[PDB]
Amino acid sequence: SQKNGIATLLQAEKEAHEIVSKARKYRQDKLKQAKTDAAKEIDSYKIQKDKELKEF
Amino acid sequence: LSLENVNDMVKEITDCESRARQLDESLDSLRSKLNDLLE
């Protein structure tokens, strides 16, 4: 099982690489996300300011 | 030896070579000043 076992170990290394690579794609996206939900955060704060203005 | 165990002992080679060189160069140039007064 020595010459079955390496072949399995090579596969594990390739796998360790793909799981870490999904996270790094995730991270970039996570950064993009932060700008989108902040784009939405301004125009919801904008309608909040018109709220206490129209109240005035 | 590991790479860190070489990397922290090369530090104490360099940190001691520096002080030994400056203390030897502050000793022979002082022996010369001693002989300049004994002459």
């Binding site: 076992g5 399995t8 594990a12 360790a16 799981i19 996270a23 950064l31 932060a34 939900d37 704060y45 | -």
Partner: protein
């Protein structure tokens, strides 16, 4: 050497590989969290200055 000793070494190592990556992925995405909040806090702050 013996088949039992090699199979013991196979499970242990491909485990080490799988675990270290799961934690590795986990650190990468934890940081992804950190940058999301810090980046949002900043970006929001500026636009809200203009709004105010």
């Amino acid at each position: 050497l013996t088949p039992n000793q090699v199979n013991d070494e196979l499970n242990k190592m491909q485990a080490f590989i799988r675990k270290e990556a799961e934690e590795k992925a986990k650190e990468i995405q934890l940081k992804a969290d950190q940058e999301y909040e810090i980046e949002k806090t900043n970006i929001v702050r500026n636009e809200t200055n203009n709004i105010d």
